[PDB]
A paper describes a structure:
Studies of the flightin amino acid sequences from many species identified a highly conserved domain in the middle of the sequence, residues W85-R131 in Drosophila, dubbed the “WYR” domain due to its enrichment in tryptophan, tyrosine, and arginine. Application of the structure prediction program AlphaFold to the Drosophila flightin sequence produced a structure for the WYR domain that was an excellent fit to the central density. The WYR domain-predicted structure consists of a pair of α-helices connected by a loop. The orientation of the predicted WYR domain structure identifies the V-shaped density as coming from the sequence on its N-terminal side and the inner extended density as coming from the C-terminal side of the flightin sequence. To obtain the final model, we removed the N-terminal residues P69-K95 from the AlphaFold model and rebuilt them de novo in COOT. In addition, the residues G140-L182 were also rebuilt de novo to fit the density. The atomic model begins at residue P69 leaving 68 N-terminal residues disordered. The myosin mutation E1554K prevents incorporation of flightin into Drosophila flight muscle thick filaments. The Drosophila flightin atomic model places flightin residue R87 in position to form a salt bridge with E1554. The second region of interaction contains a salt bridge between myosin residue E1557 with flightin loop-1 residue R124.
Striated muscle thick filaments are composed of myosin II and several non-myosin proteins which define the filament length and modify its function. Myosin II has a globular N-terminal motor domain comprising its catalytic and actin-binding activities and a long α-helical, coiled tail that forms the dense filament backbone. Here we report an improved structure at 4.7 Å resolution of flight muscle thick filaments from a wild type strain of Drosophila melanogaster. Improved resolution for the non-myosin proteins resolves the entire length of flightin within the annulus of myosin tails, resolves the ambiguity for one unassigned density, and improves the shape of the stretchin-klp densities on the surface of the filament backbone.
Numbering used by the authors: 69 to 182
């Protein structure tokens, strides 16, 4: 249908007025920063003396995983809690190991006949 179209039509909707700016959206900024993050990281830690291999180019999915690694990890990090809670009862059992002990074996007699 849009073959004999030429241009993309003049201005419309003059009287009502629409189109507030909507100037910024977050993930677009994330993508823009993503396209340069690896190279800027490489260079600015290069002046610090720490070494890294060449910034191999990354694909879009690779870029998104990179972004999640640099952003999702920062916003989502709750590793320590359940581990120590689970270790709590193991330690409690470790104290509880007394259980009156005693009896046992390889412990009998006093004879010196060898």
């Amino acid at each position: 249908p849009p073959e004999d179209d030429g241009y993309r039509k003049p201005v419309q909707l003059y009287r009502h007025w629409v189109r507030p700016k909507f100037l910024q959206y977050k993930y677009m900024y994330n993508y823009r920063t993503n396209y340069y993050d690896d190279v800027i990281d490489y260079i600015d830690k290069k002046q610090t003396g720490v070494a890294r291999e060449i910034p191999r180019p990354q694909t879009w999915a690779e870029r998104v995983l990179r972004t999640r690694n640099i952003s999702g990890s920062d916003i989502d990090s709750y590793a320590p809690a359940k581990r120590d809670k689970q270790l709590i009862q193991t330690l409690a059992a470790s104290i509880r190991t007394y259980n009156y002990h005693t009896k046992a074996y390889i412990n009998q007699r006093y004879a010196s006949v060898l």
